[PDB]
Design a binder for this molecule. Structure first.
Ligand SMILES: O=C(O)c1cccc(-c2cn[nH]c2)c1
Ligand SMILES: O=C(O)c1cccc(-c2cn[nH]c2)c1
Lengths: 114, 114, 113
């Protein structure tokens, strides 16, 4: 699976180990090995949430399955929790879009996962 | 709703007030309260459109509903008009990807909108 | 169609001509004219793939049609370009493929519908 966070929080506010923590936490939450988790953190962004430039984050979690009503609620609590604790971003200034990818539509290593 | 613009136009060419204008105009076009509108502008990008590095934009609008044939035509007219007016990007060097999100697949404030 | 590459490789390692080569190769692979191909390369990113930060890329290809099982295999072989030009191992590349409906792609004050 793939997790991306775009935030207006400065690069210096992202703690050392944040990518490793996201990797480990997402591996645990999705039930998939850390070797298949990619994480991408994009600080210093020009963004606004509800017209306000207070700390916010726009995120996506893409996975082949393990996406659904209850799972996404659990992912949102986990990820908002981490963004609040590590980046000091309020959960109500975070969006996370969830994408259930078909294996045929994820490329990797010269082929796809189909 | 969430609106992202990626462009090769320089940061200095993005006028003061641009995020706010996007926020206001998207609230009105989508019929959603401005507090739910998130906007993200990414200047200085390395990109080409039709092989040319003249000014261009690659954009996305994600929304829970309010996405459809006629609505998307109306959004493109608004958003291309704003990019042309404010960033001097010709409308024919703009792509906007529209995504109708299921409420269960948008996380916010420790939960989802389902 | 639209192709985006996000990578931790530095800007200085993206060779001259890369956006053009992507444009040309994607026009040929998708069967669509180069005038309708947009490319976006984002270097110097803070990324981990599988827990580590050796060169990697997270990519996407959005097209109105020309997306499917066999086509996507073929796109993946073509694009995993990234090895030759950016020295990224194919096993540290993900490419997300998106078959867009024409009504859901805006361009020139309207849509492709
Ligand atoms: O869920 C998976 O098994 C899996 C494994 C590797 C990559 C991905 C993935 C990459 N982009 N979107 C999903 C998913
Ligand atoms: O496949 C196409 O014909 C086509 C032409 C122009 C733009 C796009 C496109 C832009 N974003 N996602 C797809 C597709």
């Amino acid at each position: 699976p793939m997790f991306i966070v775009n935030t207006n929080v400065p690069r210096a506010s992202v703690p050392d180990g944040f990518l490793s923590e996201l990797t480990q936490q997402l591996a645990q939450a999705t039930g998939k090995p850390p070797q298949y988790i990619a994480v991408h953190v994009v600080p210093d962004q020009l963004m606004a949430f509800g017209g306000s430039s207070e700390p916010c984050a726009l995120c996506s979690l893409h996975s082949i399955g393990k996406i659904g009503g209850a799972q996404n609620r659990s992912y949102s609590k986990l990820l908002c929790g981490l963004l609040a604790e590590r980046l000091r971003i309020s959960p109500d200034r975070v969006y996370i879009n969830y994408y259930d990818m078909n294996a045929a539509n994820v490329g990797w290593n010269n082929s796809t996962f189909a």
